[PDB]
Amino acid sequence: GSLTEDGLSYKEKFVVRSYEVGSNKTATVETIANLLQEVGCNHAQSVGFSTDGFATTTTMRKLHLIWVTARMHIEIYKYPAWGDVVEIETWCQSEGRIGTRRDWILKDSVTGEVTGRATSKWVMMNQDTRRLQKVSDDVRDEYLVFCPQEPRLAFPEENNRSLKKIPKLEDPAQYSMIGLKPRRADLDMNQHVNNVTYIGWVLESIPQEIVDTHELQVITLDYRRECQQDDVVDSLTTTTSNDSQFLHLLRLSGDGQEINRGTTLWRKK
Amino acid sequence: GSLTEDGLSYKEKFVVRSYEVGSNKTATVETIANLLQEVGCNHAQSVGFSTDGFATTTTMRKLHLIWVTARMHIEIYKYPAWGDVVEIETWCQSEGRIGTRRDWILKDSVTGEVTGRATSKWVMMNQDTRRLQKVSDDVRDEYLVFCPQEPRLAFPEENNRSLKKIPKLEDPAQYSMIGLKPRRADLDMNQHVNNVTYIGWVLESIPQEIVDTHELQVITLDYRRECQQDDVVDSLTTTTSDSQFLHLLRLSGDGQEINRGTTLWRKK
Protein backbone atom coordinates (compact mmCIF):
# COMPACT_ATOMS: atom_id res chain seq x y z
CA GLY A 1 0.00 0.00 0.00
CA SER A 2 0.79 3.75 -0.20
CA LEU A 3 -0.46 7.19 0.92
CA THR A 4 -2.65 8.63 -1.94
CA GLU A 5 -1.43 11.67 -4.02
CA ASP A 6 -2.61 14.37 -1.49
CA GLY A 7 -0.97 12.44 1.52
CA LEU A 8 -4.34 12.61 3.43
CA SER A 9 -5.48 8.94 2.93
CA TYR A 10 -3.93 5.42 2.54
CA LYS A 11 -4.69 2.60 0.04
CA GLU A 12 -3.81 -1.13 0.15
CA LYS A 13 -4.83 -4.26 -1.83
CA PHE A 14 -5.38 -7.71 -0.23
CA VAL A 15 -5.77 -11.16 -1.88
CA VAL A 16 -8.39 -13.12 0.16
CA ARG A 17 -6.70 -16.35 1.56
CA SER A 18 -8.21 -19.96 1.81
CA TYR A 19 -8.42 -19.77 5.67
CA GLU A 20 -10.10 -16.24 5.62
CA VAL A 21 -13.43 -17.51 4.03
CA GLY A 22 -16.64 -19.06 5.48
CA SER A 23 -19.21 -21.62 4.14
CA ASN A 24 -20.11 -19.18 1.26
CA LYS A 25 -16.37 -19.29 0.08
CA THR A 26 -16.27 -15.46 0.68
CA ALA A 27 -14.42 -13.44 3.42
CA THR A 28 -15.91 -13.51 6.95
CA VAL A 29 -16.75 -10.11 8.57
CA GLU A 30 -13.83 -10.97 11.02
CA THR A 31 -11.34 -11.16 8.06
CA ILE A 32 -12.79 -7.85 6.80
CA ALA A 33 -12.37 -6.29 10.32
CA ASN A 34 -8.75 -7.65 10.52
CA LEU A 35 -7.93 -6.02 7.11
CA LEU A 36 -9.47 -2.66 8.33
CA GLN A 37 -7.07 -2.68 11.32
CA GLU A 38 -4.09 -3.80 9.09
CA VAL A 39 -4.52 -0.79 6.68
CA GLY A 40 -5.14 1.48 9.75
CA CYS A 41 -1.74 0.39 11.19
CA ASN A 42 0.11 0.75 7.80
CA HIS A 43 -1.38 4.31 7.53
CA ALA A 44 -0.01 5.20 11.05
CA GLN A 45 3.42 3.65 10.08
CA SER A 46 3.50 5.65 6.77
CA VAL A 47 3.47 9.02 8.73
CA GLY A 48 5.63 8.25 11.86
CA PHE A 49 2.93 7.41 14.52
CA SER A 50 3.16 4.24 16.78
CA THR A 51 2.36 0.87 15.05
CA ASP A 52 1.05 -0.98 18.20
CA GLY A 53 -2.68 -0.37 17.40
CA PHE A 54 -2.74 2.92 19.47
CA ALA A 55 -1.32 5.31 16.76
CA THR A 56 0.28 7.61 19.46
CA THR A 57 2.46 10.81 19.17
CA THR A 58 5.68 11.37 21.27
CA THR A 59 3.54 13.83 23.34
CA MET A 60 0.99 11.01 24.11
CA ARG A 61 3.81 8.45 24.79
CA LYS A 62 5.32 10.93 27.38
CA LEU A 63 1.81 11.19 29.05
CA HIS A 64 0.94 7.41 28.87
CA LEU A 65 -2.05 8.24 26.55
CA ILE A 66 -3.55 5.87 23.89
CA TRP A 67 -6.50 5.82 21.41
CA VAL A 68 -9.13 3.08 22.10
CA THR A 69 -12.14 2.18 19.90
CA ALA A 70 -15.52 3.41 21.32
CA ARG A 71 -17.63 2.14 18.33
CA MET A 72 -17.18 0.05 15.13
CA HIS A 73 -19.81 0.25 12.28
CA ILE A 74 -19.28 -2.02 9.23
CA GLU A 75 -21.59 -2.20 6.17
CA ILE A 76 -20.86 -4.91 3.46
CA TYR A 77 -22.68 -5.15 0.07
CA LYS A 78 -20.48 -8.00 -1.29
CA TYR A 79 -17.92 -10.19 0.58
CA PRO A 80 -14.77 -10.78 -1.55
CA ALA A 81 -14.43 -14.44 -2.74
CA TRP A 82 -11.25 -16.50 -2.12
CA GLY A 83 -8.51 -15.38 -4.61
CA ASP A 84 -10.31 -12.00 -5.21
CA VAL A 85 -8.34 -8.71 -4.68
CA VAL A 86 -10.08 -6.13 -2.37
CA GLU A 87 -8.77 -2.51 -2.26
CA ILE A 88 -9.19 -0.54 1.04
CA GLU A 89 -8.85 3.27 1.35
CA THR A 90 -8.69 4.73 4.87
CA TRP A 91 -8.46 8.23 6.46
CA CYS A 92 -8.89 9.90 9.91
CA GLN A 93 -10.65 13.16 10.94
CA SER A 94 -10.76 14.90 14.38
CA GLU A 95 -14.28 15.44 15.85
CA GLY A 96 -12.97 18.34 18.02
CA ARG A 97 -12.35 17.36 21.69
CA ILE A 98 -14.62 14.22 21.69
CA GLY A 99 -12.01 12.12 19.81
CA THR A 100 -11.40 11.04 16.17
CA ARG A 101 -13.08 9.03 13.41
CA ARG A 102 -11.31 6.49 11.24
CA ASP A 103 -13.31 5.66 8.07
CA TRP A 104 -12.79 3.02 5.32
CA ILE A 105 -14.10 2.31 1.79
CA LEU A 106 -13.78 -1.22 0.34
CA LYS A 107 -13.70 -1.80 -3.46
CA ASP A 108 -13.54 -4.62 -6.01
CA SER A 109 -9.98 -3.89 -7.37
CA VAL A 110 -11.10 -5.29 -10.85
CA THR A 111 -14.41 -3.30 -11.36
CA GLY A 112 -13.67 -0.45 -8.88
CA GLU A 113 -17.28 -0.70 -7.51
CA VAL A 114 -17.78 0.01 -3.71
CA THR A 115 -18.37 -3.39 -1.93
CA GLY A 116 -18.43 -2.10 1.71
CA ARG A 117 -17.73 0.84 4.04
CA ALA A 118 -16.86 1.18 7.74
CA THR A 119 -16.41 3.93 10.35
CA SER A 120 -15.01 3.91 13.92
CA LYS A 121 -14.99 6.41 16.84
CA TRP A 122 -11.83 6.51 19.01
CA VAL A 123 -11.30 8.25 22.41
CA MET A 124 -8.09 9.20 24.30
CA MET A 125 -7.41 7.20 27.52
CA ASN A 126 -4.64 7.12 30.14
CA GLN A 127 -3.06 3.61 29.55
CA ASP A 128 -2.54 3.02 33.34
CA THR A 129 -5.62 4.63 35.06
CA ARG A 130 -8.20 3.84 32.22
CA ARG A 131 -9.62 7.46 32.68
CA LEU A 132 -10.93 9.11 29.46
CA GLN A 133 -10.03 12.78 28.78
CA LYS A 134 -10.91 15.31 26.02
CA VAL A 135 -8.13 15.67 23.35
CA SER A 136 -5.73 18.57 24.31
CA ASP A 137 -4.98 21.27 21.63
CA ASP A 138 -1.17 20.44 21.56
CA VAL A 139 -2.06 16.77 20.59
CA ARG A 140 -4.94 17.78 18.20
CA ASP A 141 -2.55 19.95 16.06
CA GLU A 142 0.08 17.10 15.84
CA TYR A 143 -2.59 15.06 13.83
CA LEU A 144 -4.41 17.82 11.77
CA VAL A 145 -1.72 18.00 8.95
CA PHE A 146 -2.39 14.19 8.34
CA CYS A 147 -6.25 14.59 8.07
CA PRO A 148 -8.51 16.30 5.44
CA GLN A 149 -9.79 19.69 6.76
CA GLU A 150 -13.08 19.48 4.70
CA PRO A 151 -15.54 16.85 6.06
CA ARG A 152 -15.01 13.45 4.35
CA LEU A 153 -17.51 10.82 5.69
CA ALA A 154 -17.86 7.11 4.76
CA PHE A 155 -21.48 7.73 6.09
CA PRO A 156 -22.62 11.20 4.84
CA GLU A 157 -26.47 10.60 5.10
CA GLU A 158 -28.34 13.03 7.47
CA ASN A 159 -29.62 10.36 9.95
CA ASN A 160 -27.50 7.20 9.35
CA ARG A 161 -27.45 3.84 11.27
CA SER A 162 -23.68 4.43 12.10
CA LEU A 163 -24.72 7.06 14.76
CA LYS A 164 -27.86 5.38 16.30
CA LYS A 165 -28.02 4.74 20.12
CA ILE A 166 -27.91 0.98 21.03
CA PRO A 167 -30.24 -0.09 23.91
CA LYS A 168 -29.38 -2.62 26.71
CA LEU A 169 -30.73 -6.17 26.10
CA GLU A 170 -33.12 -7.19 28.97
CA ASP A 171 -33.02 -10.78 30.41
CA PRO A 172 -34.13 -13.29 29.37
CA ALA A 173 -32.11 -13.22 26.07
CA GLN A 174 -33.71 -15.24 23.17
CA TYR A 175 -30.28 -16.90 22.48
CA SER A 176 -26.94 -17.27 24.40
CA MET A 177 -23.41 -18.67 24.10
CA ILE A 178 -21.86 -19.11 27.61
CA GLY A 179 -18.25 -19.47 28.83
CA LEU A 180 -16.34 -17.83 25.92
CA LYS A 181 -12.60 -17.33 26.73
CA PRO A 182 -9.77 -15.80 24.67
CA ARG A 183 -6.76 -17.98 23.69
CA ARG A 184 -3.27 -16.55 22.88
CA ALA A 185 -4.16 -16.13 19.14
CA ASP A 186 -6.94 -13.65 20.28
CA LEU A 187 -4.30 -11.31 21.87
CA ASP A 188 -2.35 -8.52 20.03
CA MET A 189 1.38 -7.78 20.52
CA ASN A 190 0.40 -5.83 23.77
CA GLN A 191 -1.33 -9.03 25.17
CA HIS A 192 -4.68 -7.13 25.02
CA VAL A 193 -7.70 -8.94 23.48
CA ASN A 194 -7.95 -7.94 19.77
CA ASN A 195 -11.09 -5.86 18.92
CA VAL A 196 -12.09 -8.38 16.13
CA THR A 197 -12.44 -11.20 18.77
CA TYR A 198 -15.42 -9.29 20.31
CA ILE A 199 -17.08 -9.34 16.82
CA GLY A 200 -16.61 -13.18 16.78
CA TRP A 201 -18.12 -13.43 20.32
CA VAL A 202 -21.18 -11.28 19.37
CA LEU A 203 -21.86 -13.54 16.31
CA GLU A 204 -21.46 -16.84 18.32
CA SER A 205 -25.04 -16.40 19.78
CA ILE A 206 -26.63 -15.96 16.28
CA PRO A 207 -28.43 -19.25 15.50
CA GLN A 208 -26.67 -21.38 12.79
CA GLU A 209 -29.93 -21.41 10.66
CA ILE A 210 -29.67 -17.55 10.32
CA VAL A 211 -25.96 -17.83 9.28
CA ASP A 212 -26.86 -20.61 6.72
CA THR A 213 -29.86 -18.67 5.19
CA HIS A 214 -28.67 -15.00 5.57
CA GLU A 215 -25.67 -12.72 4.93
CA LEU A 216 -24.57 -10.02 7.47
CA GLN A 217 -25.22 -6.57 5.90
CA VAL A 218 -24.56 -4.28 8.94
CA ILE A 219 -22.82 -4.60 12.36
CA THR A 220 -22.59 -1.77 14.98
CA LEU A 221 -20.60 -2.60 18.16
CA ASP A 222 -19.95 -0.33 21.20
CA TYR A 223 -16.85 -1.10 23.35
CA ARG A 224 -17.44 -0.27 27.08
CA ARG A 225 -14.75 -2.29 28.95
CA GLU A 226 -12.03 -4.70 27.83
CA CYS A 227 -12.11 -8.51 28.44
CA GLN A 228 -8.80 -9.40 30.21
CA GLN A 229 -6.73 -12.53 29.24
CA ASP A 230 -8.29 -14.33 32.33
CA ASP A 231 -11.97 -13.10 31.95
CA VAL A 232 -14.91 -15.32 30.77
CA VAL A 233 -17.63 -13.88 28.43
CA ASP A 234 -21.35 -14.60 27.92
CA SER A 235 -22.80 -13.62 24.45
CA LEU A 236 -26.56 -12.69 24.41
CA THR A 237 -28.80 -12.14 21.30
CA THR A 238 -32.55 -11.24 20.88
CA THR A 239 -34.42 -10.92 17.51
CA THR A 240 -35.86 -7.33 17.19
CA SER A 241 -37.33 -7.58 13.59
CA ASN A 242 -37.32 -10.28 4.61
CA ASP A 243 -34.53 -8.61 6.76
CA SER A 244 -33.48 -10.10 10.17
CA GLN A 245 -32.24 -7.71 12.93
CA PHE A 246 -30.70 -8.57 16.37
CA LEU A 247 -29.75 -6.77 19.62
CA HIS A 248 -26.51 -8.13 21.24
CA LEU A 249 -24.81 -7.98 24.69
CA LEU A 250 -21.34 -9.24 25.83
CA ARG A 251 -20.91 -9.31 29.65
CA LEU A 252 -18.50 -11.04 32.10
CA SER A 253 -19.81 -14.57 32.94
CA GLY A 254 -19.60 -14.00 36.75
CA ASP A 255 -20.94 -10.59 37.89
CA GLY A 256 -22.50 -9.62 34.47
CA GLN A 257 -20.31 -6.45 33.90
CA GLU A 258 -21.15 -5.11 30.34
CA ILE A 259 -18.13 -5.16 27.95
CA ASN A 260 -20.04 -4.58 24.63
CA ARG A 261 -23.46 -4.02 23.07
CA GLY A 262 -24.35 -4.12 19.37
CA THR A 263 -26.96 -4.65 16.64
CA THR A 264 -26.72 -6.72 13.39
CA LEU A 265 -28.89 -6.64 10.21
CA TRP A 266 -29.02 -9.78 7.95
CA ARG A 267 -30.68 -10.22 4.49
CA LYS A 268 -32.00 -13.54 3.04
CA LYS A 269 -29.58 -14.92 0.36
CA GLY B 1 2.85 -16.97 -6.08
CA SER B 2 3.85 -19.30 -8.95
CA LEU B 3 4.94 -22.88 -9.82
CA THR B 4 8.79 -22.85 -10.16
CA GLU B 5 10.56 -23.46 -13.56
CA ASP B 6 10.28 -27.31 -13.48
CA GLY B 7 6.54 -27.10 -12.41
CA LEU B 8 7.23 -29.59 -9.50
CA SER B 9 7.14 -27.00 -6.62
CA TYR B 10 5.32 -23.73 -5.71
CA LYS B 11 6.62 -20.41 -4.25
CA GLU B 12 4.76 -17.48 -2.59
CA LYS B 13 5.77 -14.31 -0.68
CA PHE B 14 3.88 -13.03 2.41
CA VAL B 15 4.12 -9.63 4.17
CA VAL B 16 3.65 -10.30 7.96
CA ARG B 17 0.55 -8.27 9.20
CA SER B 18 0.12 -6.27 12.51
CA TYR B 19 -2.50 -8.76 13.89
CA GLU B 20 -0.32 -11.86 12.90
CA VAL B 21 2.51 -11.16 15.49
CA GLY B 22 2.86 -11.91 19.25
CA SER B 23 4.50 -10.00 22.19
CA ASN B 24 8.01 -10.16 20.47
CA LYS B 25 6.59 -8.33 17.32
CA THR B 26 7.38 -11.51 15.24
CA ALA B 27 4.86 -13.95 13.61
CA THR B 28 3.24 -16.61 15.89
CA VAL B 29 3.65 -20.35 15.03
CA GLU B 30 -0.16 -20.26 14.20
CA THR B 31 0.43 -17.44 11.62
CA ILE B 32 3.24 -19.57 10.10
CA ALA B 33 1.00 -22.71 10.13
CA ASN B 34 -1.81 -20.73 8.33
CA LEU B 35 0.68 -19.57 5.61
CA LEU B 36 1.88 -23.24 5.12
CA GLN B 37 -1.83 -24.15 4.50
CA GLU B 38 -2.32 -21.09 2.18
CA VAL B 39 0.66 -21.94 -0.10
CA GLY B 40 -0.47 -25.62 -0.09
CA CYS B 41 -3.94 -24.56 -1.40
CA ASN B 42 -2.45 -22.17 -4.06
CA HIS B 43 -0.23 -25.10 -5.25
CA ALA B 44 -3.33 -27.42 -5.57
CA GLN B 45 -5.13 -24.53 -7.44
CA SER B 46 -2.17 -23.98 -9.82
CA VAL B 47 -2.48 -27.62 -11.19
CA GLY B 48 -6.32 -28.18 -11.14
CA PHE B 49 -6.87 -30.12 -7.84
CA SER B 50 -9.65 -29.13 -5.34
CA THR B 51 -9.11 -25.88 -3.34
CA ASP B 52 -11.10 -26.97 -0.18
CA GLY B 53 -8.11 -28.19 1.94
CA PHE B 54 -8.48 -31.80 0.57
CA ALA B 55 -6.63 -31.38 -2.83
CA THR B 56 -8.79 -34.16 -4.45
CA THR B 57 -8.79 -35.50 -8.06
CA THR B 58 -12.11 -36.03 -10.00
CA THR B 59 -11.60 -39.81 -9.27
CA MET B 60 -11.39 -39.22 -5.42
CA ARG B 61 -14.47 -36.95 -5.74
CA LYS B 62 -16.55 -39.83 -7.33
CA LEU B 63 -15.41 -42.16 -4.44
CA HIS B 64 -16.00 -39.49 -1.70
CA LEU B 65 -12.25 -39.72 -0.77
CA ILE B 66 -10.21 -36.87 0.87
CA TRP B 67 -6.62 -36.25 2.10
CA VAL B 68 -6.45 -35.76 5.91
CA THR B 69 -3.38 -34.61 7.95
CA ALA B 70 -1.89 -37.42 10.17
CA ARG B 71 1.17 -35.40 11.35
CA MET B 72 2.48 -31.80 11.23
CA HIS B 73 6.19 -31.08 12.06
CA ILE B 74 7.48 -27.47 12.09
CA GLU B 75 11.03 -26.20 12.89
CA ILE B 76 11.60 -22.35 13.05
CA TYR B 77 15.10 -20.73 13.36
CA LYS B 78 13.81 -17.11 13.07
CA TYR B 79 10.18 -15.89 13.18
CA PRO B 80 9.63 -13.06 10.62
CA ALA B 81 9.09 -9.57 12.16
CA TRP B 82 6.00 -7.40 11.31
CA GLY B 83 6.42 -5.88 7.78
CA ASP B 84 9.08 -8.53 6.83
CA VAL B 85 8.62 -10.65 3.62
CA VAL B 86 8.84 -14.47 4.07
CA GLU B 87 9.10 -16.73 0.97
CA ILE B 88 7.59 -20.29 1.28
CA GLU B 89 8.40 -23.01 -1.30
CA THR B 90 6.33 -26.21 -1.08
CA TRP B 91 6.06 -29.61 -2.82
CA CYS B 92 4.42 -33.05 -2.36
CA GLN B 93 5.89 -36.57 -2.76
CA SER B 94 4.08 -40.00 -2.62
CA GLU B 95 5.30 -42.42 0.15
CA GLY B 96 3.85 -45.36 -1.86
CA ARG B 97 0.50 -46.75 -0.58
CA ILE B 98 0.85 -45.29 3.02
CA GLY B 99 0.01 -41.73 1.78
CA THR B 100 1.84 -38.50 0.80
CA ARG B 101 4.17 -35.85 2.29
CA ARG B 102 3.88 -32.07 1.82
CA ASP B 103 7.18 -30.30 2.70
CA TRP B 104 7.92 -26.55 3.00
CA ILE B 105 11.03 -24.32 3.22
CA LEU B 106 10.68 -20.77 4.68
CA LYS B 107 13.23 -18.05 3.67
CA ASP B 108 13.98 -14.40 4.47
CA SER B 109 13.22 -12.80 1.00
CA VAL B 110 15.95 -10.08 1.53
CA THR B 111 18.88 -12.44 2.59
CA GLY B 112 17.57 -15.68 0.95
CA GLU B 113 18.56 -17.45 4.27
CA VAL B 114 16.43 -20.51 5.45
CA THR B 115 14.38 -19.37 8.58
CA GLY B 116 12.28 -22.56 8.94
CA ARG B 117 11.11 -25.86 7.39
CA ALA B 118 8.03 -28.08 7.86
CA THR B 119 6.80 -31.49 6.79
CA SER B 120 3.39 -33.21 7.05
CA LYS B 121 2.09 -36.76 6.42
CA TRP B 122 -1.37 -37.11 4.81
CA VAL B 123 -3.55 -40.28 4.59
CA MET B 124 -6.55 -41.03 2.28
CA MET B 125 -9.96 -41.37 4.02
CA ASN B 126 -13.62 -41.92 2.99
CA GLN B 127 -15.13 -38.55 4.09
CA ASP B 128 -18.51 -40.16 5.13
CA THR B 129 -17.41 -43.46 6.83
CA ARG B 130 -14.05 -41.96 8.12
CA ARG B 131 -12.34 -45.32 7.21
CA LEU B 132 -8.63 -45.07 6.20
CA GLN B 133 -7.59 -46.88 3.00
CA LYS B 134 -4.18 -47.34 1.28
CA VAL B 135 -3.76 -45.15 -1.88
CA SER B 136 -5.22 -46.60 -5.17
CA ASP B 137 -2.68 -47.15 -8.06
CA ASP B 138 -5.05 -45.20 -10.46
CA VAL B 139 -4.99 -42.28 -7.88
CA ARG B 140 -1.16 -42.47 -7.29
CA ASP B 141 -0.66 -42.03 -11.10
CA GLU B 142 -2.91 -38.87 -11.22
CA TYR B 143 -0.46 -37.13 -8.71
CA LEU B 144 3.01 -38.46 -9.87
CA VAL B 145 3.36 -35.95 -12.84
CA PHE B 146 3.08 -33.02 -10.26
CA CYS B 147 5.68 -34.38 -7.73
CA PRO B 148 9.50 -34.79 -7.97
CA GLN B 149 10.61 -38.38 -8.85
CA GLU B 150 14.03 -38.17 -7.00
CA PRO B 151 13.60 -37.93 -3.18
CA ARG B 152 13.37 -34.24 -2.04
CA LEU B 153 13.17 -33.94 1.81
CA ALA B 154 12.81 -30.86 4.06
CA PHE B 155 14.26 -33.33 6.70
CA PRO B 156 16.74 -35.64 4.87
CA GLU B 157 18.69 -37.11 7.94
CA GLU B 158 17.73 -40.80 8.79
CA ASN B 159 15.71 -41.03 12.11
CA ASN B 160 15.26 -37.19 12.45
CA ARG B 161 12.91 -35.40 14.94
CA SER B 162 10.08 -35.36 12.26
CA LEU B 163 9.69 -39.22 12.29
CA LYS B 164 9.96 -39.97 16.11
CA LYS B 165 7.13 -41.88 17.95
CA ILE B 166 5.16 -39.64 20.48
CA PRO B 167 4.09 -41.40 23.74
CA LYS B 168 0.75 -40.87 25.58
CA LEU B 169 0.94 -38.39 28.50
CA GLU B 170 -0.20 -40.09 31.78
CA ASP B 171 -2.39 -38.44 34.47
CA PRO B 172 -1.79 -36.33 36.37
CA ALA B 173 -0.56 -33.73 33.77
CA GLN B 174 1.81 -31.04 35.14
CA TYR B 175 -0.29 -28.24 33.48
CA SER B 176 -3.83 -28.07 31.92
CA MET B 177 -6.22 -25.69 30.13
CA ILE B 178 -9.77 -27.18 30.24
CA GLY B 179 -13.09 -26.41 28.50
CA LEU B 180 -11.61 -25.13 25.17
CA LYS B 181 -14.30 -24.76 22.42
CA PRO B 182 -14.01 -23.70 18.74
CA ARG B 183 -15.86 -20.54 17.54
CA ARG B 184 -17.02 -19.91 13.89
CA ALA B 185 -13.59 -18.27 13.12
CA ASP B 186 -11.84 -21.65 13.93
CA LEU B 187 -13.89 -23.44 11.17
CA ASP B 188 -12.89 -23.65 7.44
CA MET B 189 -15.27 -23.31 4.44
CA ASN B 190 -16.27 -27.04 5.03
CA GLN B 191 -17.32 -26.14 8.66
CA HIS B 192 -14.56 -28.51 9.97
CA VAL B 193 -12.22 -27.25 12.74
CA ASN B 194 -9.09 -25.73 11.07
CA ASN B 195 -5.84 -27.77 11.73
CA VAL B 196 -4.05 -24.62 13.14
CA THR B 197 -6.70 -24.37 15.98
CA TYR B 198 -5.31 -27.71 17.47
CA ILE B 199 -1.84 -26.03 17.49
CA GLY B 200 -3.27 -23.05 19.48
CA TRP B 201 -5.01 -25.51 21.91
CA VAL B 202 -1.80 -27.55 22.50
CA LEU B 203 0.11 -24.29 23.34
CA GLU B 204 -2.68 -22.95 25.71
CA SER B 205 -1.36 -25.30 28.49
CA ILE B 206 2.27 -23.98 28.18
CA PRO B 207 2.83 -21.69 31.20
CA GLN B 208 3.00 -17.93 30.29
CA GLU B 209 6.46 -17.67 32.02
CA ILE B 210 7.80 -20.18 29.37
CA VAL B 211 6.23 -18.17 26.47
CA ASP B 212 7.72 -14.95 28.01
CA THR B 213 11.35 -16.31 28.40
CA HIS B 214 11.54 -18.90 25.52
CA GLU B 215 10.98 -19.12 21.74
CA LEU B 216 9.28 -22.24 20.25
CA GLN B 217 11.88 -24.03 18.06
CA VAL B 218 10.08 -27.37 17.20
CA ILE B 219 6.45 -28.63 17.27
CA THR B 220 5.38 -32.21 16.27
CA LEU B 221 1.60 -32.89 16.41
CA ASP B 222 -0.28 -36.15 15.57
CA TYR B 223 -3.95 -35.84 14.51
CA ARG B 224 -5.94 -38.92 15.61
CA ARG B 225 -9.58 -37.71 15.48
CA GLU B 226 -11.48 -34.46 14.74
CA CYS B 227 -12.96 -32.04 17.30
CA GLN B 228 -16.55 -31.41 16.05
CA GLN B 229 -18.13 -27.87 16.07
CA ASP B 230 -19.98 -28.85 19.36
CA ASP B 231 -17.08 -30.73 21.18
CA VAL B 232 -15.14 -29.40 24.22
CA VAL B 233 -11.37 -30.03 24.53
CA ASP B 234 -8.90 -30.35 27.44
CA SER B 235 -5.22 -29.45 26.79
CA LEU B 236 -2.56 -31.25 28.95
CA THR B 237 1.25 -30.57 29.11
CA THR B 238 4.14 -32.16 31.15
CA THR B 239 7.83 -30.95 31.15
CA THR B 240 10.02 -33.84 29.81
CA SER B 241 13.28 -31.82 30.21
CA ASP B 242 16.31 -26.12 26.29
CA SER B 243 12.73 -26.80 27.58
CA GLN B 244 10.77 -29.84 26.21
CA PHE B 245 7.07 -30.79 26.82
CA LEU B 246 4.75 -33.73 26.06
CA HIS B 247 1.22 -32.66 24.96
CA LEU B 248 -2.23 -34.32 24.86
CA LEU B 249 -5.60 -32.94 23.56
CA ARG B 250 -8.67 -35.02 24.54
CA LEU B 251 -12.50 -34.50 24.66
CA SER B 252 -13.52 -32.78 28.00
CA GLY B 253 -16.10 -35.51 28.86
CA ASP B 254 -14.96 -39.13 28.23
CA GLY B 255 -11.25 -38.27 27.55
CA GLN B 256 -11.17 -39.49 23.88
CA GLU B 257 -7.70 -38.59 22.40
CA ILE B 258 -7.76 -36.11 19.46
CA ASN B 259 -4.04 -35.07 19.36
CA ARG B 260 -0.69 -35.82 21.00
CA GLY B 261 2.50 -33.79 20.45
CA THR B 262 5.87 -32.49 21.68
CA THR B 263 7.38 -28.94 21.72
CA LEU B 264 11.07 -27.81 22.10
CA TRP B 265 11.78 -24.22 23.36
CA ARG B 266 15.12 -22.29 23.65
CA LYS B 267 15.85 -19.44 26.15
CA LYS B 268 15.85 -16.06 24.24
Ligand SMILES: NCc1noc(-c2ccccc2F)n1
Ligand atom coordinates in the same frame (compact mmCIF):
# COMPACT_ATOMS: atom_id res chain seq x y z
N1 LIG C 1 -7.45 13.09 14.16
C1 LIG C 1 -6.61 12.35 15.11
C2 LIG C 1 -5.84 11.23 14.51
N2 LIG C 1 -5.62 10.14 15.16
O1 LIG C 1 -4.86 9.37 14.25
C3 LIG C 1 -4.72 10.13 13.16
C4 LIG C 1 -3.95 9.60 12.04
C5 LIG C 1 -3.87 10.32 10.86
C6 LIG C 1 -3.14 9.83 9.80
C7 LIG C 1 -2.47 8.63 9.91
C8 LIG C 1 -2.53 7.90 11.08
C9 LIG C 1 -3.26 8.40 12.13
F1 LIG C 1 -3.31 7.67 13.27
N3 LIG C 1 -5.30 11.29 13.27
Ligand SMILES: NCc1noc(-c2ccccc2F)n1
Ligand atom coordinates in the same frame (compact mmCIF):
# COMPACT_ATOMS: atom_id res chain seq x y z
N1 LIG D 1 1.37 -37.66 -3.76
C1 LIG D 1 -0.06 -37.40 -3.63
C2 LIG D 1 -0.42 -35.96 -3.71
N2 LIG D 1 -1.32 -35.44 -2.96
O1 LIG D 1 -1.34 -34.08 -3.36
C3 LIG D 1 -0.42 -33.98 -4.33
C4 LIG D 1 -0.22 -32.68 -4.96
C5 LIG D 1 0.81 -32.51 -5.87
C6 LIG D 1 1.00 -31.28 -6.48
C7 LIG D 1 0.17 -30.22 -6.19
C8 LIG D 1 -0.87 -30.38 -5.30
C9 LIG D 1 -1.05 -31.60 -4.70
F1 LIG D 1 -2.07 -31.73 -3.83
N3 LIG D 1 0.18 -35.11 -4.58
